[PDB]
Structure 1
Amino acid sequence: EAHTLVTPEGNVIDIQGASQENGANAIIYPRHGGENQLFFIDKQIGWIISVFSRKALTVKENMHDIVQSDYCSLSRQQWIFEDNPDGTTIIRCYENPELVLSVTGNIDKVCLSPFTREAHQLWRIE
């Protein structure tokens, strides 16, 4: 079933432009419930797949930028989900689990950053 990934402010991860193309950015955007803000999650595989494009959230080779791309079982496309008692989830890069799904300074783009329990590193998966 499809999930939305929600920041503390109530905005959500969003595939920019509702693109179906490889390399499209994962951004932060106001909630509208469209399929480019919905994701399938498989904890056994570790993947996070855009419902609209069927492409996987992918860490680029620089280990910071996040895009969607065709899934090819890369460690940079696999995630470890660490649940917290308050219902949030830390989403850790399988290749380097110190690095977790985070947001940029503007809080408008998803990126990878070292875990400091910063507020926007604690995602709500609904």
Structure 2
Amino acid sequence: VPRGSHMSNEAHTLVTPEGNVIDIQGASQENGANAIIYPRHGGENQLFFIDKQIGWIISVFSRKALTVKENMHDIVQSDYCSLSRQQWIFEDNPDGTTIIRCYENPELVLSVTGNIDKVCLSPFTREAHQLWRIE
């Protein structure tokens, strides 16, 4: 309906340069489940809502937020709690890629531990997997 509201309804994928996607491991609905890289398969555990009014990234399947652990390296899903470790700056590049920076320390950006391995937070060095495609 019944209303006009300013908020994205689109489910997104977060895509690597090889075409793989951020995926919540095991299609888990639990706190602490790892974010990993996986080939795209249509499943809801690879889809995320992104709200650029506040900067959250929420799993469509679990409704939990992409979160950097307190260690400032590991990326999991966890209940949204308005934490700086759950809020992201989307730096949009002219080529259509995006640097996804941690609000708590924006020098630390969404990265991978390997091409088809885990998602992590790492210092920005313009490494290829720090340049995401939000589809």
TM-score (norm 1): 0.98
- Root-mean-square deviation (CA, aligned residues, Å) is 0.7
Q: CA deviation at 1:108?
A: 1.0
Contact 2:67 2:85 in 1 (8 A): yes
Q: CA deviation at 1:44?
A: 1.2
Contact 2:31 2:77 in 1 (8 A): yes
Provide the secondary structure at the position in 1 that maps to 2:101: strand
TM-score (norm 2): 0.92
Partner of 2:22 in structure 1? 13
Q: Can you list the C-alpha shifts for 1:52-104, whole angstroms capped at 9, x where unaligned?
A: 00000000000000000000000000000000011000000000000000000
Unaligned 5+ residue runs, structure 1? none
Q: Can you list the C-alpha shifts for 1:27-63, whole angstroms capped at 9, x where unaligned?
A: 0000002100000000111100000000000000000
Number of residue equivalences: 126
Unaligned 5+ residue runs, structure 2? 1-9
Q: Indicate the larger mover: 98-107 or 39-48.
A: 98-107
**% identity of equivalent residues:** 100
Q: CA deviation at 1:107?
A: 3.7
Q: Decide which structure has the larger Cα Rg and report it.
A: 2
Contact 2:23 2:36 in 1 (8 A): yes
Q: CA deviation at 1:111?
A: 0.1
In the alignment, the residues of structure 2 paired with residue 105 and residue 53 of structure 1 have an alpha-carbon distance, to the nearest angstrom, of 25
Residue of 114, 117, 120 corresponding to 2:126: 117
